[PDB]
Amino acid sequence: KLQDSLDAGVGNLVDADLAKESAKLQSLQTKQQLGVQALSIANSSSSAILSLF
Amino acid sequence: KLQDSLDAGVGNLVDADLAKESAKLQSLQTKQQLGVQALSIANSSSSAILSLF
């Protein structure tokens, strides 16, 4: 019983809660796509000046 | 006879009614599956915003 409680305690110390990581994963994938889109918007600022010339 | 009645009384105090636990077990397994499905629905809320960009 003592060996089982030491192993369960190690699990309390280091194990991930995977049900919570699933939510973090989905939101982070959406954030990465929005970040690529925002960088694409920032890249195009120079093209606006071409119209004046 | 007194020893048998003391042992039966301990059983009245602590024993589980397993026919009732079988119903609780089945309903709880269904509830766990529905909870995983509900968490899966909640995880997907961010993906709706990607359409606007």
Swiss-Prot record, chains A, B:
Domain of life: Bacteria
Residues in coiled coil: none
Localization of this protein: Secreted; Bacterial flagellum
Family: Belongs to the bacterial flagellin family.
Function: Flagellin is the subunit protein which polymerizes to form the filaments of bacterial flagella.
Subunit-level organization: In C.crescentus, the flagellar filament is composed of multiple flagellins of 29 kDa; 27 kDa and 25 kDa.
Record protein name field: Flagellin FljN
Species assigned in the record: Caulobacter vibrioides (strain ATCC 19089 / CIP 103742 / CB 15)
Gene that encodes it: fljN
Shown stretch of the complete protein: 220 to 272 of 273
